[PDB]
Amino acid sequence: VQFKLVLVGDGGTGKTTFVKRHLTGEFEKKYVATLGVEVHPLVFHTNRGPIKFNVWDTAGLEKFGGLRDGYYIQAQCAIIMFDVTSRVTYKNVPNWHRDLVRVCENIPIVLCGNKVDIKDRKVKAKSIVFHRKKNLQYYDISAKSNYNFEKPFLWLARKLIGDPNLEFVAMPAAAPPEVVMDPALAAQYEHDLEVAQTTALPDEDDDL
Amino acid sequence: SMEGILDFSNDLDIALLDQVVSTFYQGEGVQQKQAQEILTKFQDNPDAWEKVDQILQFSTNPQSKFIALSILDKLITRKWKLLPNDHRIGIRNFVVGMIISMCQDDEVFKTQKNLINKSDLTLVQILKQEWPQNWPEFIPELIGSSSSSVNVCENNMIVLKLLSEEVFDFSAEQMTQAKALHLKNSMSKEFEQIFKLCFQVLEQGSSSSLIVATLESLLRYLHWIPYRYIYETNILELLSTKFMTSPDTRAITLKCLTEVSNLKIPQDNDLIKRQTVLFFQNTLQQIATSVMPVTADLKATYANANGNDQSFLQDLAMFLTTYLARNRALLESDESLRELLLNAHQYLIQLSKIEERELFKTTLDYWHNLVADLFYEPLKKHIYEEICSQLRLVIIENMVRPEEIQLYKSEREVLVYLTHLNVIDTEEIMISKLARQIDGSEWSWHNINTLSWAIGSISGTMSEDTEKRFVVTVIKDLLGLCEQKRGKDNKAVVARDIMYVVGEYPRFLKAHWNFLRTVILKLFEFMHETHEGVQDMACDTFIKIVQKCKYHFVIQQPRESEPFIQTIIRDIQKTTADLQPQQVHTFYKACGIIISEERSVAERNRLLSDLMQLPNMAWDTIVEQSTANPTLLLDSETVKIIANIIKTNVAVCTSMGADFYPQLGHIYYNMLQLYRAVSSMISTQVAAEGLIATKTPKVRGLRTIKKEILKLVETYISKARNLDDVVKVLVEPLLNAVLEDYMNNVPDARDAEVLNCMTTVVEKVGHMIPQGVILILQSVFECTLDMINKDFTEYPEHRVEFYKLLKVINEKSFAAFLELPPAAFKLFVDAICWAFKHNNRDVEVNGLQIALDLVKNIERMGNVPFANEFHKNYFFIFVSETFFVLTDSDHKSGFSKQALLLMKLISLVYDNKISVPLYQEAEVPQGTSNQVYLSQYLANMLSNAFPHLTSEQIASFLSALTKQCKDLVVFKGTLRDFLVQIKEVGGDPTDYLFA
């Protein structure tokens, strides 16, 4: 049970950051532009069993665009992403949508306005209506605060499985093993832990 | 092995390409990644297009052919015009032939839609280059080949759709103005024949796939074609009857009819009105008989999400709202149209019950339109009474919290209008929903909350007397609910909702002092409750009530010994004893609001003195101790206490502004001594521990003290009325305490808040302290520039605050830049251009504005040596830096301000407003106008930067640009035209004559 998902939108909108958060849990603060596409499997556990997304995280910058719409072939779902702190990224939503549906004519698509965590929002709720005539689901999201960050995938899963009551569930957690500390690595740890204690945790002003 | 396709010295092994492509689309992990890179390098090879024929002929992988077509598209869209005519016709004929071949084979047509659609778009790209001037018979041949084959006819509809999109829907940014108009006129000239074909296919029918594709093209045509093609043929009737009855065509037809509803149409023609009514009548009839009756439960349908029901229902809401917003008046006068009007609205009511946020928003926009008009329009509401009654329930049951700012606003506005239209109906619905909460049948946290938000939203719509009776009923009812409920969780939810409602009804509070007093006292009781959310809601309700009712706390109410503000302050220690610091600050901020209602200076100052008693006394003790034992600042507890005192001051200063001065004066000297002592400690700790010290709790705590001090000063100065005191008392000690400390700390220890504070100082009193501004620049300019001029990412706060500070200095105290040494002024110019190159909108916009303001500042100086030297040294730097960010495709968000700057610079020369030559001697005949030399410089600069442009292109562009340098809109169009032309070869230089 696996589905190809393409992720498109302007450079810097947070596509890769959002996927990474989902894959590993981390929040990457740096902007390293994607080169062509990055492909990563991503699994959720539902009340109907596991669902795998084959995530094609494509490049938004023209100069790094690679195969462009070539990446869209045989996609079964999509996320179009913009940045609510950048008007141009919303202005380009119809261009991404155009290029996407010319290749993928009848697929579920979520439009996502990312970075709603930032106070000075530039693309106002009132302005975001493009999704209505194109039958796209819409969510405000923040890869940084995790506002609504499950919603795009939960929605797509409900559409692809064809069950509107599908939920993400907790899978039971296996009992973890007892430990054996090698006295040969004893010192090894002292070092590695020394480095870790003296590297500051990020974002010490946040609520957690 | 896979890298072999990249070796062009050999012939291309198609089977290898097909392997690479398969490995990419169907492979995994490491293999997929390698193929990926290889395919990208293949595709981006500038000679790759030469292999397209071979791949399209001999590959058996449709993904390979798809990528081949991408390669060809790059050629067609960028370098087409370099090809000889015979080759262009060769390619054209190959693409056409491949499309027809694929369509004539039923198996391939069925199974290879991806490759065909890609081919069709490739063709459309060729039409954009070649048609009609180099291909006048394209449309006749397309029309002709349509009768040969149903598959070809169907595919031809996809081509015409894509053509229409490229010419009408997406041309604006992808083509020159002149080319867009050319292709628009060209499609217009031949549309008559195109429509004849579309109509015939619709009339004759049969193939649903063909019908659907035709209707898809029509939806695009409706963006631009004249109304007569719809209204003066049978096509309206076809759309609104036949094509609504079959579900294969219903979706596209409904979208078509929505766009039909938006056509430009004559207003004074009874036949057209009857046609507008009729197609609506037809469409709604087809829905009622073929899809679902008016009574259907659309909430349930949508929820079940069968087939394409969700999309269909979305599309129906869009059609009803679009049509009714424009045409409902057509249905309102004639009593034979009453049922139709009300049924259409009834469907909307049912759609409005669908649990789908974004669909709700679409219907809500319509309801807002309707109820607003019923509020104003004469002889109308009577029609919609039952609709409005249902809608009241729908809105009340869907009210969101006011934190959802836009949706709450929309919902409140609709409910307010509905309340005005029938106050009694609204009241009854609310009381009876409250009864359902009390009887347990509808009880839940969500439900009592939404009801409370709804009750709160309509505050101010009722008469004061109706409001009074309503409010009392609601409060009694909610108090009863609270009692009934068992357990702190439940009672806490109801209590918050009571707090909420009461806070939304200030008019009632203002008329009933005894009740207002009781509410505050009860909020104070709640400020001792540990249960989560209760203290926060108590404090938030307190300040909300204060914002609206403050006058009632500052006067002596009858049967009271004193103004309640006095009572609040007398007991403040006990009231706030269990609050978290943030809550305490809100409380003090609220008290500040009240105190500013007192306009007797002496009484105000004494109230302020009394409010600040506890923070001032703690301050006084620490001042002694902290100084005596500087180690005390190392005490975590001490640092926390100090920070909170400052924060308390900030909170009160926020609400009192100019009135806060006596309190700022009381602490000012010791506060700046504390700033210096904390600065010592920070420096001391960074010396002893390294840069890592800045991450420690102790140092972050010390810096918090510095930041809050800067915030307090910023807050006061931004609202101060007596600027003479600001300058005479506040500014000098401030600059002395903060500037050198900022300049002589290492980058990682410098607080960007310093810059922000200085921005406020210069904003408010810049003109009054010329020497202070000079001092600010000397302290912060070079050291900050050096922090942010190595990349675009380091020190983001400093970066933003830095350009805000330069902006205000260049606005208010330009003389400070005049007193800079030439070398420092050159750094200033470098700084401005640096901001241009930023993609961050904050920095970029300020960069452009400073540039613009600086030019104006220079212009003002008139014909003197500094201004003449400015132009000689920097005019060309500004012109070329601005062209750089215009043309590099990485700074599109700055386009408008870039254009404005560029226009101002070009106009300076076109008007002869620069007094000396811009060229250095013996570079050009010595009489030569700056106009001619500017033409020469730009032509040379653009030729070098864009060598594929002709001289004719560059000369026409500059000629247009200089002529248009007093008309921003046209200028901007010429710039955009240029941005299109630099992306291709062979752009028409006459495009710049567009008018």
Added chain:
Amino acid sequence: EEDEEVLYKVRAKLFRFDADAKEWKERGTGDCKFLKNKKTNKVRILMRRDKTLKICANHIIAPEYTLKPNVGSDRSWVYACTADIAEGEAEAFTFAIRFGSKENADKFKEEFEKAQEINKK
């Protein structure tokens, strides 16, 4: 997880140290639970992310482990863990876990020591 008793529940953010990048990377934010297995009486940490409910920590509170301060925080602990099975195959990690307040971090340490004592039996 009804074969387990909930000894302690607290909201936390969890990090793992990446030596390669020499930086802390978030692993998850959500409820950190101390679960006592009612068969073995062994206590584990189990932590699930908000929204997705995915497992970001699953390991025994080993007696040998020592909670250490991070230079940047008065409300975190760092410790080495030699076998965590959140992502499947048991791996060693240098973890940091941060809480809402110093109070919470202190309480966590109190309970973490209580768990170590239980696991020593």
